[PDB]
Design a protein around this ligand. Structure first.
Ligand SMILES: O=C(Cc1cccc(Cl)c1)Nc1cncc2nc[nH]c12
Ligand SMILES: O=C(Cc1cccc(Cl)c1)Nc1cncc2nc[nH]c12
Lengths: 304, 304
């Protein structure tokens, strides 16, 4: 029992972290096989960041200008290329600690672990969700760029995020491992709208099921609702509309607890309309949306 | 910017996890040098757990009865001894992945990361605090026993906790790495009082400073208080009395923000007496006490 915001064990990812320096800028890189991936803004100075012409800036750089250090050892760079907002630095040595891996583009509302790094060295690990507006509410300081987000399935690491930027609002933006930003963001020092965010309804319902499994049941009521009725409430409270696809993904939790998804929707409707009344659910005084139905089953079943 | 419940990177600890089986019981062990440490209740059957005579139960076991597997390879057990509530199994091979380490007994109110494991395999990592009543509110299932808590300082892992038991209340109890339980607990299947818990005041104040550093400032007021006045409020709200030692440890955060510790105490006093009024601080609708002043400085400075 107990329910925590659990991250994946970070060991497989720690073994891939390197420091990349270009000119006066240092950030993190990810070394997989004989390629090091890092944000392309490693080639910029502070003056360049207002409106960088990355193509022109990269033309002034040669392989020897990219200093890549894996712990205390230097990697020899034999090639460089820009793919969208990432640089791929070909090195002459395959990372001996390369785990089985994939590059995936996650959907908004999905979760992943972040290994925050500085100077190629891991500082900490935390779990978070990709917001419906494609930002992440992480914990990142100057130098964290190049830190990655990932999920693990047995021995395979699926990398889904590389950190690039902090918006003036203090939220975070980054790319998939092919360098494509999640959301409308561009890698420039300009104010950029993130746009309206919403609460991840299917994740809140999953967390309510986790609460019932772990004994927090005070919010269960004698009511039920329909998808249409519930979605009128979700609209008022800035929650994502619940679809049958979301109801289907909640099937395993509904079967385990014996609580029909629409009955749990009625509990959620009552919590939205009345608040918590000073009570808590799984140590939280707000409705949590950073656990997917898969995360709940994984944590409640002890998947390694 | 941003503030997360960040755990230490778990890689150094993942390299020490092994599966220990004795008879029909399987749990986790920690392999450091040529010793494997695990909860002594690995020698019990379910019938034994009501009131185990560990000395007698261990006498019926020989080195060959302890099956220790590091991933897929078997370790040869050449000695066994019980130290308080842990078993130390001497093996013929030093763990090649043994990091620099220490065994420490942490104080209540301090924090640490847990690497939850099942069958010797890591499932997840999370940060938590040792409650003032010596329990931890973890996320652990049957088979998680032997999972450890730890802190990292540069390249040295200080192990402070080994998981042993879940109380009937759903909270967790365990030992230091010398097998001494934190708190009054015994390794038996009996209902056991945890006793009154309190909120870790110095940690709440540290988190309020983290909130100010990250821009959440709505709770700052025009008031101040004294240690005596604040402690009358702490008493009413089941908070630990604040001492000058706690004020001293908050010095760096008070210097960084320019907010005197007693002025932050007045903000905390007002939040305790009036609640959050439906507002949040660092994404929380309650006063968080699982970040120490050291954790706040570490996260806000990017220590690796
Ligand atoms: O935002 C940047 C640098 C940057 C500026 C403009 C565009 C780009 Cl792509 C990158 N670094 C950063 C990241 N995360 C957190 C931080 N806190 C301070 N700086 C942080
Ligand atoms: O509590 C036990 C077994 C046990 C019983 C009596 C005394 C001792 Cl020392 C150990 N295992 C366990 C731990 N954490 C979480 C769990 N959820 C289910 N079982 C869990």
């Amino acid at each position: 029992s107990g329910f925590r915001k659990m991250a994946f064990p970070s060991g497989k990812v720690e073994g891939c972290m390197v420091q990349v320096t270009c000119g006066t800028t240092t950030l993190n890189g990810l070394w997989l096989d004989d390629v090091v991936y890092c944000p392309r803004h490693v080639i910029c100075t502070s003056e360049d960041m207002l409106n960088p012409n990355y193509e022109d800036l990269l033309i002034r750089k040669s392989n020897h200008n990219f200093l890549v250090q894996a712990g205390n050892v230097q990697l020899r760079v034999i090639g460089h290329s820009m793919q969208n907002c990432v640089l791929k630095l070909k090195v002459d040595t395959a990372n001996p600690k390369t785990p089985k891996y994939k590059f995936v583009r996650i959907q908004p509302g999905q979760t992943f672990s972040v290994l925050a790094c500085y100077n190629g060295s891991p500082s900490g690990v935390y779990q978070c969700a990709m917001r419906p507006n494609f930002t992440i509410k992480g914990s990142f300081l100057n130098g964290s760029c190049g830190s990655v987000g990932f999920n693990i399935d047995y021995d395979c690491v699926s990398f889904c995020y590389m950190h690039h930027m902090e918006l003036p609002t203090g939220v975070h933006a980054g790319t998939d491992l092919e360098g494509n930003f999640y959301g409308p963001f561009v890698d420039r020092q300009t104010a950029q709208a993130a746009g309206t965010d919403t609460t991840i309804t299917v994740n809140v319902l999953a967390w309510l099921y986790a609460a019932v499994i772990n004994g927090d049941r005070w919010f269960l009521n004698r009511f039920t609702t329909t998808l249409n009725d519930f979605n009128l409430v979700a609209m008022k409270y800035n929650y994502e509309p619940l679809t049958q696809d979301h109801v289907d993904i909640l099937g395993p939790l509904s079967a385990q607890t014996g609580i029909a998804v629409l009955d749990m929707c009625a509990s959620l409707k009552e919590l939205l309309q009345n608040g918590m009344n000073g009570r808590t659910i799984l140590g939280s005084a707000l409705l949590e949306d950073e656990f997917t139905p898969f995360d709940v089953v994984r944590q409640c079943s002890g998947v390694t």
